[PDB]
Amino acid sequence: TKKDRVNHCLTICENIVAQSVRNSPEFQKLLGIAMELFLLCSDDAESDVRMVADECLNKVIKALMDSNLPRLQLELYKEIKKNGAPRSLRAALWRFAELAHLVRPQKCRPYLVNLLPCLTRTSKRPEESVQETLAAAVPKIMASFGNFANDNEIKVLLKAFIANLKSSSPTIRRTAAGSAVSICQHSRRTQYFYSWLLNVLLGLLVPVEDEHSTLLILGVLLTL
C-alpha cells in the first residue's frame, strides 16, 4: 500500500480549504483529528512519501492564517510534549517559529509557560538533526515570545544549554551557543542579561593554568 498511502494524505487537504465554512461547531472537530495525521505521512520512511506529503501540510496553514489561527496552534503544541520520533518532532518545529509572530499578545502569556518544559527536553536530545532546527527557532520564538517572561523563567533556561556545551559533537556545539545569545536580545532587560553570561563562562576558565577538558574550551569561545 505504498502507492495507496500517497493518495490518502492529499485528499484530506483539499476538502478543508474548499469547505468555505469556518468557526463552526461542526468545523472545529474535524481539524483536530486529521492534523496530527499529516505528520505520520512524513514519519513513514520513504522519500516518495516523505517529500510528497510534507509540502501538502503547508497548503493548510497559509490558507488558514487569517481564519483559524487559535485552532491551528493548539494541536501543534501537543506534539512537542508527546516528544515523538526524531523525524516526526523535527518538521513540526519549522512550523512553530514562523507562527510565533502571528499570535496575539492577549493569548501569548499562556503560550510562554508551557514551552519551557518542552524546550528543555529537546535540548537534552542527542540526535544531531533535532538539535539543528532549534538553532533556527530559538532565534525566532524567543524574539516574539521574549518580552513576556520574568526574571525567574529565563534563569532556568540558560543553565541547560551550557550543559549542552559539554558534548563532543561539532553539530551540537554550535546550536547551544546561538541559543544563549538570542534570548538576551529579547529577555526582559537586554543589558542586564549581557553581564550575566560573562560571569558564568570565566569560571569555566578560572585561572588558565589548569586542565580544562579541551572539548569544553571550545564551548566558551563560540558563545562569545
From Swiss-Prot:
Upper lineage: Eukaryota, Metazoa, Chordata, Craniata, Vertebrata
Top-level taxon in the UniProt lineage: Eukaryota
Mapped HEAT repeat ranges: 110-147, 152-189
Disease implication from the record: Huntington disease: A neurodegenerative disorder characterized by involuntary movements (chorea), general motor impairment, psychiatric disorders and dementia. Onset of the disease occurs usually in the third or fourth decade of life. Onset and clinical course depend on the degree of poly-Gln repeat expansion, longer expansions resulting in earlier onset and more severe clinical manifestations. Neuropathology of Huntington disease displays a distinctive pattern with loss of neurons, especially in the caudate and putamen. Lopes-Maciel-Rodan syndrome: An autosomal recessive neurodevelopmental disorder characterized by developmental regression in infancy, delayed psychomotor development, severe intellectual disability, and cerebral and cerebellar atrophy. Additional features include swallowing problems, dystonia, bradykinesia, and continuous manual stereotypies without chorea. Some patients manifest seizures.
Protein name: Huntingtin
Family: Belongs to the huntingtin family.
Residues spanning the signal sequence: none
Entry comment describing in which tissues the protein is expressed: Expressed in the brain cortex (at protein level). Widely expressed with the highest level of expression in the brain (nerve fibers, varicosities, and nerve endings). In the brain, the regions where it can be mainly found are the cerebellar cortex, the neocortex, the striatum, and the hippocampal formation.
Domain-level remarks: The N-terminal Gln-rich and Pro-rich domain has great conformational flexibility and is likely to exist in a fluctuating equilibrium of alpha-helical, random coil, and extended conformations.
Modified-residue entries (N6-acetyllysine), positions: 82, 140
Subunit structure, interactors included: Interacts with PFN1. Interacts through its N-terminus with PRPF40A. Interacts with PQBP1. Interacts with SETD2. Interacts with SH3GLB1. Interacts with SYVN. Interacts with TPR; the interaction is inhibited by forms of Huntingtin with expanded polyglutamine stretch. Interacts with ZDHHC13 (via ANK repeats). Interacts with ZDHHC17 (via ANK repeats). Interacts with F8A1/F8A2/F8A3. Found in a complex with F8A1/F8A2/F8A3, HTT and RAB5A; mediates the recruitment of HTT by RAB5A.
Species name: Homo sapiens (Human)
Full-length numbering of the shown residues: 95 to 318 of 3142
Gene this protein is translated from: HTT
